[PDB]
Design an enzyme around this catalytic site. Sequence first.
Site, mmCIF file in Angstrom:
data_model
loop_
_atom_site.group_PDB
_atom_site.id
_atom_site.type_symbol
_atom_site.label_atom_id
_atom_site.label_comp_id
_atom_site.label_asym_id
_atom_site.label_seq_id
_atom_site.Cartn_x
_atom_site.Cartn_y
_atom_site.Cartn_z
ATOM 1 N N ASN A 19 1.380 7.409 2.881
ATOM 2 C CA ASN A 19 2.278 6.521 3.523
ATOM 3 C C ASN A 19 3.897 6.839 3.525
ATOM 4 O OD1 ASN A 19 -0.089 5.302 4.594
ATOM 5 N ND2 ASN A 19 -0.452 3.565 2.660
ATOM 6 N N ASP A 40 1.079 -1.078 0.585
ATOM 7 C CA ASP A 40 -0.069 0.227 0.050
ATOM 8 C C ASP A 40 0.863 1.447 -0.575
ATOM 9 O OD1 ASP A 40 -2.716 1.023 -0.206
ATOM 10 O OD2 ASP A 40 -2.515 1.425 2.466
ATOM 11 N N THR A 89 4.930 -35.460 -7.916
ATOM 12 C CA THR A 89 3.992 -35.673 -9.137
ATOM 13 C C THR A 89 3.141 -34.938 -9.186
ATOM 14 N N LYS A 134 1.684 5.058 -1.086
ATOM 15 C CA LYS A 134 1.144 6.520 -1.318
ATOM 16 C C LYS A 134 1.918 7.491 -1.384
ATOM 17 C CE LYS A 134 -2.378 5.117 0.376
ATOM 18 N NZ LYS A 134 -3.422 5.328 1.745
ATOM 19 N N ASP A 141 2.088 2.631 7.364
ATOM 20 C CA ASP A 141 0.841 1.915 7.031
ATOM 21 C C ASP A 141 1.930 0.331 6.566
ATOM 22 O OD1 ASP A 141 -0.362 4.590 8.370
ATOM 23 O OD2 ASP A 141 -1.766 4.088 6.101
#
Lengths: 286, 286
Positions: free
Chosen positions: B126, B121, B161, B123, B142
């Site tokens: 943040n 997140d 397998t 941005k 954050d």
Amino acid sequence: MSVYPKALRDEYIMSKTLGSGEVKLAFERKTCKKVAIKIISKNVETEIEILKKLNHPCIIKIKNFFDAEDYYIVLELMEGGELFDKVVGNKRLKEATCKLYFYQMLLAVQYLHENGIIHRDLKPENVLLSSQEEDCLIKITDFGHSKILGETSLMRTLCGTPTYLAPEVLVSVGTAGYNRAVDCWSLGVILFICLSGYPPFSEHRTQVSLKDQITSGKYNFIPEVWAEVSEKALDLVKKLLVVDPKARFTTEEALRHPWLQDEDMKRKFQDLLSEENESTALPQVL
Amino acid sequence: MSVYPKALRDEYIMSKTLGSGEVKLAFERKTCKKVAIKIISKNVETEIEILKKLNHPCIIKIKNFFDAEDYYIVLELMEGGELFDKVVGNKRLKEATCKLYFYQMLLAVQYLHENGIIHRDLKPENVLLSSQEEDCLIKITDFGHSKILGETSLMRTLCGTPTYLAPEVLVSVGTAGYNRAVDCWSLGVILFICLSGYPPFSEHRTQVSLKDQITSGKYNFIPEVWAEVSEKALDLVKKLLVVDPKARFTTEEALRHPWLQDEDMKRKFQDLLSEENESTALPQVL
Ligand SMILES: Nc1cc(-c2cccnc2)n[nH]1
Ligand SMILES: Nc1cc(-c2cccnc2)n[nH]1
Ligand SMILES: [Cl-]
Ligand SMILES: [Cl-]
């Protein structure tokens, strides 16, 4: 050079091995009844949590649990053992038997999905037969690889403006919430093995890699083998072994398929159900 | 119509709001030093676990934690506030400032990935600035949406397998372990905003949906705006805003990019670092 914990030993009398990997036969002291004890060497907490909450006649029931130097899971004993031992090395089940077992696997897996649980590891070695009789009840086992549903992480992300959201995340939206289709693939591979005696994808007598066979969805079709098998049965296999998980048959679509519209089969399962349930039937209000 | 828990109150003197959503300024009683207290209304345990283990100058440090009727996270105060408030509504930072901040975001995110943590997140809201000065230290905040690394579930599955393994699972193998590239996309969207004053993808003055702009990777290029920006800066943006996450620039590739080969910028950050660190410098063995 090892002992069973005092707590397990207080309640159960441990006996012979049913299947190593280990699974032992035991006797509950209080009831003098046979039980199966699955020993995991030191995800099990998730498996117990799932098992305790789930309640269906075609899903294994947890009876008790011991978290010691190893994990001990007390389960109901299945006297028929693994379905794998009925299909191993080109051994083939009669079509009627395949239906009776398949129907139950479909009901079990529908229940799981209905309840938001994806098994993730369906195989003939994870399908247990209730008795040494061919007409019997089956139960799904090994919820070790099972996952609990919810695309919650994507759902939470989608609640915002994607100003900063990467394109791959927006791409995944198309497929998201089709993880359960992995179990329908697995059932489709199971149904192929049961009907034919052979696997649809293998590295035996072929040039193409196991990866490529699966990605292309090009299963080994041996006509001579399948000639003794109905067109309805094979149509269902073809419908579950679909590469696109969005296009793939669901448990609901499979259960609605003509091959499963068998009242004799449905009656036999109901008769086996009431036979098991008769022992624990409380008298009821009339 | 609410109070602070007795435990928080015993250690800190709560003050004015720094940012609602809430984040309050507080004073640690023992030190008489300013702190920031993040209040989460009743994933936080994961966030604390991550924060406590991570130790980098460009990642926010957890000072204390209170699990009451709400969650209280005591963090180091960042007097410059959010980077978002420097870029909001067509406001643009000078190229040098963009580099100084970007370099730190790259070092911080490299560290996270090195340590197997994906922020998820990133941005401007943040990214926190240490002071009201344009030449300052930044710190990433954050870690609510952060994820702990390991394709472990696929890795475990691949050990067997794939007789019963669904094709979609075999397909995912190609992409698996490129989740961290989501943070490089985010940084790329951040760097675009900083340099231009405007977002690369928006529903403002356009017909094409935000989804389609992002999936196609066709960002809004306004020449008049970018004319005042170097070709090196834009080359890096172009390199991070790549639709294919396997082709996308990593933090290592970005840090090796010509735009970041700035010794003046690197020196300024080092000078700001030693300035912060000077207060807590223990005398050392010579
Ligand atoms: N729960 C359970 C397991 C088993 C079993 C039986 C034979 C071989 N392997 C496993 N019965 N019941
Ligand atoms: N940890 C932290 C948060 C903040 C802050 C400051 C201003 C606005 N929003 C948040 N400073 N330090
Ligand atoms: Cl013993
Ligand atoms: Cl108060």
